Amino acid sequence: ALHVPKAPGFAQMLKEGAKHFSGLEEAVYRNIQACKELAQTTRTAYGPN
Amino acid sequence: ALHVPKAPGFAQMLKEGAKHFSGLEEAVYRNIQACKELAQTTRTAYGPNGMNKMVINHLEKLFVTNDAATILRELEVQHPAAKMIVMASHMQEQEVGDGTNFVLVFAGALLELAEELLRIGLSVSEVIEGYEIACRKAHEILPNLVCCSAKNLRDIDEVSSLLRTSIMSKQYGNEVFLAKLIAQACVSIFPDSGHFNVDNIRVCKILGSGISSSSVLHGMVFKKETEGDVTSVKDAKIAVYSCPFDGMITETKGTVLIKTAEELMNFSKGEENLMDAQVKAIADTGANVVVTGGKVADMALHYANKYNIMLVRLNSKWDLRRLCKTVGATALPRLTPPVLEEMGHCDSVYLSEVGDTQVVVFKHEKEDGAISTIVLRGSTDNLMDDIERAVDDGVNTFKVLTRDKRLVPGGGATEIELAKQITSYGETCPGLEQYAIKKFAEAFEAIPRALAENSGVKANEVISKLYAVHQEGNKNVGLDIEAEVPAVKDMLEAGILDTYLGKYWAIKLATNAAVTVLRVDQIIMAKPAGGPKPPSGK
Amino acid sequence: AAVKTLNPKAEVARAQAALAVNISAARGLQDVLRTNLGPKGTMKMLVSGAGDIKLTKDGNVLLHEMQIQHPTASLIAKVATAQDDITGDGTTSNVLIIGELLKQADLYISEGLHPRIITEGFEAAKEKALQFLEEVKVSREMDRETLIDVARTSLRTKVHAELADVLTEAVVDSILAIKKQDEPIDLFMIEIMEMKHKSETDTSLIRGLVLDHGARHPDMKKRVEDAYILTCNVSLEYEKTEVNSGFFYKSAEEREKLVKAERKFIEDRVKKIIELKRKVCGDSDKGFVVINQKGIDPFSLDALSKEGIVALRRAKRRNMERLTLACGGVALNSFDDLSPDCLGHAGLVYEYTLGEEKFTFIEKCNNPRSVTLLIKGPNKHTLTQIKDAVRDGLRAVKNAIDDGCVVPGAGAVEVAMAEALIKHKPSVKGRAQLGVQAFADALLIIPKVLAQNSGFDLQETLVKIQAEHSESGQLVGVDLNTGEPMVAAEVGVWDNYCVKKQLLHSCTVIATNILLVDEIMRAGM
Amino acid sequence: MAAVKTLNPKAEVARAQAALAVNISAARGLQDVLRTNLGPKGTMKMLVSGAGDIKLTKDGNVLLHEMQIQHPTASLIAKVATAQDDITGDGTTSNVLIIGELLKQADLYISEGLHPRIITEGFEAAKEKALQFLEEVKVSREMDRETLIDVARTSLRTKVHAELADVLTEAVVDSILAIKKQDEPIDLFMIEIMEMKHKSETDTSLIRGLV
Amino acid sequence: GHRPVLVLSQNTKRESGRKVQSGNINAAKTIADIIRTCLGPKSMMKMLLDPMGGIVMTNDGNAILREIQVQHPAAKSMIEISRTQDEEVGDGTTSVIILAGEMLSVAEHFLEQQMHPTVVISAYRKALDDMISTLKKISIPVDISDSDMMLNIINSSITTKAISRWSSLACNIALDAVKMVQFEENGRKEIDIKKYARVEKIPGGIIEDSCVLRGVMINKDVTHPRMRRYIKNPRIVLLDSSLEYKKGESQTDIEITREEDFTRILQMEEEYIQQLCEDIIQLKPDVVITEKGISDLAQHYLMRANITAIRRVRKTDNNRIARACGARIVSRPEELREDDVGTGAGLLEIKKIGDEYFTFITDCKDPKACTILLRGASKEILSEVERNLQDAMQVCRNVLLDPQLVPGGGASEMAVAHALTEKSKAMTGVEQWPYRAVAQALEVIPRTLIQNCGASTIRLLTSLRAKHTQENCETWGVNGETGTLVDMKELGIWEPLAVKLQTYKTAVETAVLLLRIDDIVSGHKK
Amino acid sequence: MMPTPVILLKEGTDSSQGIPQLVSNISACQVIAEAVRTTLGPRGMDKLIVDGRGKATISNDGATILKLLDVVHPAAKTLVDIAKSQDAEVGDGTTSVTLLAAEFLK
Numbered sequence A: 001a002l003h004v005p006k007a008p009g010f011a012q013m014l015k016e017g018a019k020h021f022s023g024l025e026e027a028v029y030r031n032i033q034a035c036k037e038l039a040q041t042t043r044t045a046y047g048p049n
Numbered sequence B: 001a002l003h004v005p006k007a008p009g010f011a012q013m014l015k016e017g018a019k020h021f022s023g024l025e026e027a028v029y030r031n032i033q034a035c036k037e038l039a040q041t042t043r044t045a046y047g048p049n050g051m052n053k054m055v056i057n058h059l060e061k062l063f064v065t066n067d068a069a070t071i072l073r074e075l076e077v078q079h080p081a082a083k084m085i086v087m088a089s090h091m092q093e094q095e096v097g098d099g100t101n102f103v104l105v106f107a108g109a110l111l112e113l114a115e116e117l118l119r120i121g122l123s124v125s126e127v128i129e130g131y132e133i134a135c136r137k138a139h140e141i142l143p144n145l146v147c148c149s150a151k152n153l154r155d156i157d158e159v160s161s162l163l164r165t166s167i168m169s170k171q172y173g174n175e176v177f178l179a180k181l182i183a184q185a186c187v188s189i190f191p192d193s194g195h196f197n198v199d200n201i202r203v204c205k206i207l208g209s210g211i212s213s214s215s216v217l218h219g220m221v222f223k224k225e226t227e228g229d230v231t232s233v234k235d236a237k238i239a240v241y242s243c244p245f246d247g248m249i250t251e252t253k254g255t256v257l258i259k260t261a262e263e264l265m266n267f268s269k270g271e272e273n274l275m276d277a278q279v280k281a282i283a284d285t286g287a288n289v290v291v292t293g294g295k296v297a298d299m300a301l302h303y304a305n306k307y308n309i310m311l312v313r314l315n316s317k318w319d320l321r322r323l324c325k326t327v328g329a330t331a332l333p334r335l336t337p338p339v340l341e342e343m344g345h346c347d348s349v350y351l352s353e354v355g356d357t358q359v360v361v362f363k364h365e366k367e368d369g370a371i372s373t374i375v376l377r378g379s380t381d382n383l384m385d386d387i388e389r390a391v392d393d394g395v396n397t398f399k400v401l402t403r404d405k406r407l408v409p410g411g412g413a414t415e416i417e418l419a420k421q422i423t424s425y426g427e428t429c430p431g432l433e434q435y436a437i438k439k440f441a442e443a444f445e446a447i448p449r450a451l452a453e454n455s456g457v458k459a460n461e462v463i464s465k466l467y468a469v470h471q472e473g474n475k476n477v478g479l480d481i482e483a484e485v486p487a488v489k490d491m492l493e494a495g496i497l498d499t500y501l502g503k504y505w506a507i508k509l510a511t512n513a514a515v516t517v518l519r520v521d522q523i524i525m526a527k528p529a530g531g532p533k534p535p536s537g538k
Numbered sequence C: 001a002a003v004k005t006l007n008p009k010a011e012v013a014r015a016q017a018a019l020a021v022n023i024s025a026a027r028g029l030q031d032v033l034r035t036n037l038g039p040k041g042t043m044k045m046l047v048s049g050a051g052d053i054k055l056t057k058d059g060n061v062l063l064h065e066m067q068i069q070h071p072t073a074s075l076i077a078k079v080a081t082a083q084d085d086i087t088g089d090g091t092t093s094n095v096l097i098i099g100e101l102l103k104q105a106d107l108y109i110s111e112g113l114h115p116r117i118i119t120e121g122f123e124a125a126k127e128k129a130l131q132f133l134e135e136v137k138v139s140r141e142m143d144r145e146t147l148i149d150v151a152r153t154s155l156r157t158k159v160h161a162e163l164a165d166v167l168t169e170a171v172v173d174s175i176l177a178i179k180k181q182d183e184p185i186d187l188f189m190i191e192i193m194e195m196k197h198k199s200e201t202d203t204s205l206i207r208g209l210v211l212d213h214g215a216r217h218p219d220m221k222k223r224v225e226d227a228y229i230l231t232c233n234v235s236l237e238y239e240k241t242e243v244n245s246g247f248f249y250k251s252a253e254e255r256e257k258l259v260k261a262e263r264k265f266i267e268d269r270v271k272k273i274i275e276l277k278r279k280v281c282g283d284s285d286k287g288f289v290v291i292n293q294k295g296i297d298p299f300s301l302d303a304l305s306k307e308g309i310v311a312l313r314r315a316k317r318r319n320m321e322r323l324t325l326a327c328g329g330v331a332l333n334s335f336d337d338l339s340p341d342c343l344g345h346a347g348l349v350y351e352y353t354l355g356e357e358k359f360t361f362i363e364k365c366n367n368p369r370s371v372t373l374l375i376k377g378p379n380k381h382t383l384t385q386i387k388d389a390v391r392d393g394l395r396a397v398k399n400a401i402d403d404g405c406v407v408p409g410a411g412a413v414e415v416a417m418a419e420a421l422i423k424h425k426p427s428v429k430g431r432a433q434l435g436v437q438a439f440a441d442a443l444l445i446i447p448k449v450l451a452q453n454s455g456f457d458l459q460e461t462l463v464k465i466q467a468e469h470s471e472s473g474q475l476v477g478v479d480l481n482t483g484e485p486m487v488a489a490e491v492g493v494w495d496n497y498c499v500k501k502q503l504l505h506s507c508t509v510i511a512t513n514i515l516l517v518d519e520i521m522r523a524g525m
Numbered sequence D: 001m002a003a004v005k006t007l008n009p010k011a012e013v014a015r016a017q018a019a020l021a022v023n024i025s026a027a028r029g030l031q032d033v034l035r036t037n038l039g040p041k042g043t044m045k046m047l048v049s050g051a052g053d054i055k056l057t058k059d060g061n062v063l064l065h066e067m068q069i070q071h072p073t074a075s076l077i078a079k080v081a082t083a084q085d086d087i088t089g090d091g092t093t094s095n096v097l098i099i100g101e102l103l104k105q106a107d108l109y110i111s112e113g114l115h116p117r118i119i120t121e122g123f124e125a126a127k128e129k130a131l132q133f134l135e136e137v138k139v140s141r142e143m144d145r146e147t148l149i150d151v152a153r154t155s156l157r158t159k160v161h162a163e164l165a166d167v168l169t170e171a172v173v174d175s176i177l178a179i180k181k182q183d184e185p186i187d188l189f190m191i192e193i194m195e196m197k198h199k200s201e202t203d204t205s206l207i208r209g210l211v
Numbered sequence E: 001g002h003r004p005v006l007v008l009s010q011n012t013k014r015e016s017g018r019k020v021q022s023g024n025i026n027a028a029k030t031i032a033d034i035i036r037t038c039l040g041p042k043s044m045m046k047m048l049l050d051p052m053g054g055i056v057m058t059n060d061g062n063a064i065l066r067e068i069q070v071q072h073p074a075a076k077s078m079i080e081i082s083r084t085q086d087e088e089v090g091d092g093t094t095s096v097i098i099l100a101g102e103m104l105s106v107a108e109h110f111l112e113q114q115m116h117p118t119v120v121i122s123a124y125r126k127a128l129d130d131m132i133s134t135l136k137k138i139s140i141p142v143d144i145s146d147s148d149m150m151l152n153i154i155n156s157s158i159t160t161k162a163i164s165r166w167s168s169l170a171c172n173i174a175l176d177a178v179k180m181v182q183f184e185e186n187g188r189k190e191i192d193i194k195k196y197a198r199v200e201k202i203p204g205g206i207i208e209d210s211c212v213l214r215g216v217m218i219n220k221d222v223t224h225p226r227m228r229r230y231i232k233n234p235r236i237v238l239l240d241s242s243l244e245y246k247k248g249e250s251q252t253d254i255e256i257t258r259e260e261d262f263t264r265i266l267q268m269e270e271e272y273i274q275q276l277c278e279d280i281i282q283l284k285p286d287v288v289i290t291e292k293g294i295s296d297l298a299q300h301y302l303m304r305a306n307i308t309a310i311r312r313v314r315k316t317d318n319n320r321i322a323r324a325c326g327a328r329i330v331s332r333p334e335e336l337r338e339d340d341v342g343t344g345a346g347l348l349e350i351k352k353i354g355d356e357y358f359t360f361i362t363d364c365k366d367p368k369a370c371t372i373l374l375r376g377a378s379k380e381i382l383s384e385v386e387r388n389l390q391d392a393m394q395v396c397r398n399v400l401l402d403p404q405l406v407p408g409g410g411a412s413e414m415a416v417a418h419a420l421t422e423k424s425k426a427m428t429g430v431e432q433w434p435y436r437a438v439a440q441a442l443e444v445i446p447r448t449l450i451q452n453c454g455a456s457t458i459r460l461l462t463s464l465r466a467k468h469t470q471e472n473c474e475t476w477g478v479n480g481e482t483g484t485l486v487d488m489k490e491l492g493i494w495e496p497l498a499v500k501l502q503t504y505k506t507a508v509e510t511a512v513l514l515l516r517i518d519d520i521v522s523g524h525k526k
Numbered sequence F: 001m002m003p004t005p006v007i008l009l010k011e012g013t014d015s016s017q018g019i020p021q022l023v024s025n026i027s028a029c030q031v032i033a034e035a036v037r038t039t040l041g042p043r044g045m046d047k048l049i050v051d052g053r054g055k056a057t058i059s060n061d062g063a064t065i066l067k068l069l070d071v072v073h074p075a076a077k078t079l080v081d082i083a084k085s086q087d088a089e090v091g092d093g094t095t096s097v098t099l100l101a102a103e104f105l106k
């Protein structure tokens, strides 16, 4: 009653180092966050100033 | 594609160290194999020709013996099924006192034949029911196999002849001498009242002279020394005290409050005079031996020496109680002089030396008394331990004979007769239970087979001869160990006899253990723990 | 996930993963406990870390002894523990029904159905099922025969057939001995004392008490024919002053006087006891037994033994009530005013010695309102198994007496309930009919498991029983010897009404709550 | 713990219902992953290799190859799908889904004590009946341009975006019709697939020659 | 050697700038997303694993938040505001978190657009004041004398919990307990349900058998079996001092020189016990409940007068019994008076439940304390039922203190949002944009209700907003089951005004607090 | 011999059976006798044994020499025990007992 086991099926068959992101919140929003961060890093060099 | 994952469900939920065995092959066959291994280990010690085993326990205390119960106790058994068989054997030992090796042999044979029956197709329930029916039939048959009864237990020759068979399995070379000793010891005990107490026989082991010098004493022996000057008393009038041989003190707290010089100068003199008066009052009753359970004060010892009183100190309360029983004295809780009924009497009390051991002997002269002591000589501690085990077996045999006087032939005659009758009964039973009944009958063959194997002859010819003779109509014919060729002879003439209760209880317990082991289908073993034993075992 | 984003060392299962984890755990528990159900079940061997052997068939004991570290298993274990604490039976059926409900619900959830509709169907089916159970119960006057039938139905499932037959008489007689008219039954008045020296079939019922301690003085009588019982809670040993008294003396004679005087408090109570004993019996015909909850020092023991009184010290706390109800005396906390009417009466007291352990028997009471059960067996695990079996039997008999109605067993009631639920399904609005069907198919697990454990197969046995029930309407169960349908009421296979109601309620509630869980979380570190 | 365990202590064995549950769980997991692939309304998956290469795909065979699985049943199903893709070139996702559903429906009856042999016999009978029905239901037709366009639509719409699928339909149909010889097997080696990386993804087309 | 020289100690990290604000707002959004799905009548329960090995299967937002551990300080602030909301009003714990997360999320937009956080905070406070005004405007009064309306309010409170199946029984239990606990003395009204409304959980039985007793129930039993376990109209005497013989605190030592002094001391101990028992008996009670031990001799002396005694009872239980049966706890029995004797209990029964003895002092007339006896499937189910009953009792107390009600199911959210937008339409400063942003961010509650109901968010929410653009539509929300817009004057879902006020205040103030923060510093020691 | 996943006794249990263990026991008794042979007769020689503490026990009595030997062989300990027995009962002959026992066995 102290450890949550891995769900049966694909969750258990996944390799040791592999990651599986699925669903709106887990995939689309995180990708959008990463792209927004990249644009933020490059933003300050835009324009003559 | 290189690993087989654990099956979903219970297999994944099992703890890290646990083990789960389910089904015939994984549980029942393994349990039967373990029980068979245990029985095989103990088998070679069965019978008069059985040989001792040197067993070293976890404390490096050496045990050498051919008593099956002792070997099992000193063996660190781990398999739960073998543990169950060991528990059955120990219950057999506690209930009767002999037949533990019979319990192991019968249980192992039953489980092996049950395994082969399960292999040929019979279900567990059918085998269990067949064994139960066959055990009931054997219990019904057994009383008809009784050959003779003890019919007297106050005699010496008859009791020795009865206990000779019991203590011939252990110490095969010299059983007549041990039989005589144990017979005398038990006949002194066992008064007109039918009740016989096993604990009323005390065994004292003094090293040096070889076991042929052992004797029986109508009294009691302590491996201690007298604490006074007097070392011998001729007409002892023992007075037993459970209190320390010293002046009593308050249980709350005692402080000597001195306010004047006179009290300070007189306190010690008054205390000494009080002790002297108490000791003289004790001595004036005629008591010339004083036995105390506590410490002895110096002033009390001096005043006892002044009045020629032997002092004996017994630390163990059990020793004090047994001395009171064997002398007839009452353990006084205070140091008051004993009244005439409370004063015990012993025909002779004296300090003596046996070998290098100093002993105090409370010796009677009558062939009676509540407690009798057997002094065991020898050349080794292990040898005396084995002799003590044989003495315990003989005493338990005498107790059983007091409980029930019926006897059955030994030497495998009873087992072969039982096998023949149970096989005959099984052939008349239609249905699948006949195989189980026949296998239960065949399991009785393991006793004469083990006896023949230990005696050094070929077992099969012995068993075939036993069947031939029993079919001829002789129910009292068993193995003859006094021959180099497979041969049989009548047990009744030889006097090789076994107690009826011993066989009855052994059969019942072996069958119960085998059936209970067979009833188990799944095993769930927790991860072993290194904890320092459960608190119940202390 | 969000939890792992906040707490990196967090274990989380979400939605479908949560359902999969819960249902897999329930299925594993069901697969383990399938073999337990019914008298034809298989016993298990349970070896602890210390090597202790535990042979058992009870569902609750098994659940407590399996080496499981799963959350859903913990929830189901708590439910079964509550079941056992209140009713004392049906834990295995509880686990089986929970697992079957979860499996049947998953059978529909995997096809896109939302669990909420399944739970609504479960609620409707539970209400209809409870109504049907109310309708189908058999109200009866609980005579000895019906109680024997119920006790048999429990014990035969728990232990060996012959041992069960003995325990039936033992348990039924024990309950009937202490039962009072229209008064709740106190099971604390049935002492369960176990010895370890004879066969399992030697278990019997003693119309009195058996105490696990004996007299501490060798000179006390080992057997008293006719005895007066004095149940007291008074210390008879030396007691120290609460205010740090201490003694002061100036000579040995003064010390002797103070030593003799300090015993007067205990000596007064011993003298009162002795005077009462002399008054009640002026000859040696009658006996006197003193059972004290507190210690008795050797001086008091010797003083009592010189008067021919048997004294037992450090008795159990419940033994005070048990002796007052059985022997019929009055438990005394002080000897301020003790009269002969406060003495109990026992028609036989004797001591039994078992190796190092001693026992005292108190039999031949007049109308013993408290009795004892003597568990005898060659092994410790046999004693434990028999103790659990008699606990189950006592609970079953008490429930049967408390509820004047009893329910036919052998799986008949579940078959009838399933048919009634199927008939009622069209009346349910919406897609909750799927939940109703799942509930009915889950209720049908009991006859299925009985057929499995009896060696038959589920399909044709179940369809034969269902067809027989539809043709006649009788409550037909499972005949574990032939597999044919059989009327449980006629043969005498009864189940407790309270047990069935508790199973329905608890199983439905826990299944509904588990199905609505969409996230197992562990972020407390 | 079993027969094999005694001889080889470091052996991993799953026997009887354990093995059945293991196989069915693996098949169900594969089916759960590939459920979202089926149909033109399916969802694209992003697969990242160890080196960091990004591969957006919807093909069942490609996803099976690029999934991070080490299960024996998964390997068997992957081999079956690979053979399907090698021969016919379509239906891998349907293969996985049908296998998983077959195993699930079989276990639905097996858990009720039914032996798997009966289920397999029923499978054989159903398979032969289904083959007969499929033979009876197929539509014999003249493979004109319109029918080939419809088939190419039905495949490419499930594979890619609708506009790209519309372009690729004309491209592939014209390419096949160009190299097709009457009453001769079609040699797919004669359609070179050369990729250039400078224009928009709708600029792919067919060249009546070689590049 | 030459160890490095530095200003601040090692492991003293520091962050600053937009990174800290983005991190704080993201942490708040994550906390909101943790429990977003646990809002509404169609919520899904969550299963939490205690570090001690326990399991908490709950739907309450506060329990879920307090059962998890976080490292980011903004998440800690969110947990703190959840606990504050739970303590202050009793419910709304999983709504304030969502509201605060949404407010911070919409403030991030303005933070990234060169707007100083002070302007945002000022706009937030203006919005909060106008929210308070609008809620006080759209509220409706309630007559607490009508039991049906109170039951309806409690039901609307508990439809989102797991006890909605037995809602009727739960509402009756909560209302009865709150009414009985209600008390007044010296002109000071008091409704203290945390001390005198005790919830006792006995696993087993059926939850339909749960009830509120007109008395108290403790897990105790008679000291002596011969004592009566069933008294019709008991007179109760409560004590919180031992009935034994005890040493004095002064160091007292005796010095015994005479023979009889020891026995005399023991006899005086017995006589002291007898004198105490006689002092108790002089009042002629029927049951004596003590907080400390009772000596066996005292038990005998009490039994001679046919008096049942219970030995050791906790302080809280003794106070609760005193409130229920009208007794008064007295330490020294010599000062015991007639007024201290507790009459008013209608029955004392010591029955057996399962394998335990429980003491009932039920059937009281005018009892000011109660014990809610809960029975159910298991321990976790009973814990969740107890939490739901706590929510119901808190809502009932809030309604009793403040008889104001406001529409539920998002109707209040949309009404306040529309009023805020209409008021902002006349604003001219730069502050109008964050003001309107908070106004529309208040619409997260109906959106979350629709999302949990499984309906389509965009069209339903647009239609709801269009409905609220009309004049007399302030009571239009959504169905948590069917996903349709209904008038809450017809559906009947209402929540106390105090709950909504506390929720809005806490959400806006948490947004302000986390907006004021910059330049996180960590690593130092106490 | 097969692994037998669950074993009968605890691991590390040593069992020796048959004629070879008896011959080994006889050899051990021979070693014990040889350890004291040269102390017999008017031409006997003493033995010096040093304990762990460093104390030296120079002796000619056979029983003392056997006691100072830290014998752990179960069969060899019998010779030490009988030497102690002979010393206790009589006081002389503690070498002859061991020599005779080992000679019988040989």
Ligand SMILES: Nc1ncnc2c1ncn2[C@@H]1O[C@H](COP(=O)(O)OP(=O)(O)O)[C@@H](O)[C@H]1O
Binding pocket: B045, B046, B047, B048, B050, B067, B068, B098, B099, B100, B101, B102, B103, B165, B168, B169, B170, B409, B410, B411, B412, B451, B479, B480, B481, B496, B498
């Ligand atoms: N002189 C003898 N000849 C043949 N058999 C004997 C003789 N003495 C004893 N036995 C047999 O030996 C068996 C006793 O074996 P034993 O080693 O005592 O095992 P246990 O201690 O378990 O009883 C008895 O069954 C008896 O029949």
Ligand SMILES: Nc1ncnc2c1ncn2[C@@H]1O[C@H](COP(=O)(O)OP(=O)(O)O)[C@@H](O)[C@H]1O
Binding pocket: C036, C037, C038, C039, C058, C059, C089, C090, C091, C092, C093, C094, C153, C154, C156, C157, C408, C409, C410, C411, C450, C477, C478, C479, C480, C493, C494, C495
């Ligand atoms: N002799 C019998 N014949 C047919 N059915 C039986 C018989 N005995 C018991 N049963 C049925 O089998 C079930 C036994 O369940 P049991 O093993 O007692 O589980 P639990 O201990 O959890 O109640 C009962 O529900 C009863 O209806």
Ligand SMILES: Nc1ncnc2c1ncn2[C@@H]1O[C@H](COP(=O)(O)OP(=O)(O)O)[C@@H](O)[C@H]1O
Binding pocket: E038, E039, E040, E041, E043, E060, E061, E091, E092, E093, E094, E095, E096, E156, E157, E159, E160, E407, E408, E409, E410, E449, E477, E478, E479, E480, E481, E493, E495
């Ligand atoms: N039947 C219903 N239909 C629509 N909305 C409802 C219904 N019942 C309750 N609600 C809404 O759900 C919210 C209560 O959800 P709950 O889980 O209790 O959250 P909290 O714990 O924050 O109060 C209230 O704001 C109320 O407006």
Ligand SMILES: [Mg+2]
Binding pocket: B098, B099, B100, B169
């Ligand atoms: Mg023997």
Ligand SMILES: [Mg+2]
Binding pocket: C089, C090, C091, C154, C157
């Ligand atoms: Mg049962």
Ligand SMILES: [Mg+2]
Binding pocket: D090, D091, D092, D155, D158
């Ligand atoms: Mg395709």
Ligand SMILES: [Mg+2]
Binding pocket: E091, E092, E093, E157, E160
């Ligand atoms: Mg709420």
Ligand SMILES: [Mg+2]
Binding pocket: F092, F093
């Ligand atoms: Mg010499």
